[PDB]
Amino acid sequence: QKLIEDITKEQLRTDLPAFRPGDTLRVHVKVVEGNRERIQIFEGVVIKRRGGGISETFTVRKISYGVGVERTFPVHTPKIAKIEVVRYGKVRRAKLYYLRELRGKAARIKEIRR
Template sequence: MFSKIINEFEKKQLKNNLYKIKVGDFITVEINVFDKLRKNKIQYFSGIIISIKNKRICSSIIVRKYSNGEGIEQLFFIHSNNIKNIIINNSNRVRKSKLFFIKKNKFNKLIKTNKKYINI
């Protein structure tokens, strides 16, 4: 009985229009941010997807970008109400399911994809 209640709650919270994203895509995430005066602002975070976790309402992606030579990672929950839109800038086929090796390397390293090399 308890699981039925949870399933009904999750169905209401899940977004129907899922994004066709995969690991290795360069994306831009539009985030709704509230400031102290309760004004709604849109903040953009663009980078490469290094991980995807698919667990129903807890589905999440980790996006990594480089700013001023420093690597910044952000965790986004796909079904969150704060995410307004996800725009795919460049779609690439990568041979790994998790790209955590990008953290250890310099940001100018190359990722080998199916057809071409992409400079990160």
């Protein structure tokens, strides 16, 4: 896909920090409520890390007011401003789907600091 790679390069976002699939990074996202853009911080654990250049995405997730939220973020979207990895975490796998059902302290066991 060398030609396909040539197109994606123009929209490539090298500014984004490198990170492991298992961590509590905090994506910033402007929201056009109209007219001013609010900045909603959203901490959570990433799970999926699908490949495919610009099409790459990751699934940050967070419990909120007793209920979880699954807000996927594409890796190279313009809407992201900055990403801060508050904590690193050891992971025996790559697809941590199971943790969402394991409320609540059990989820923290996979969230061990590194």
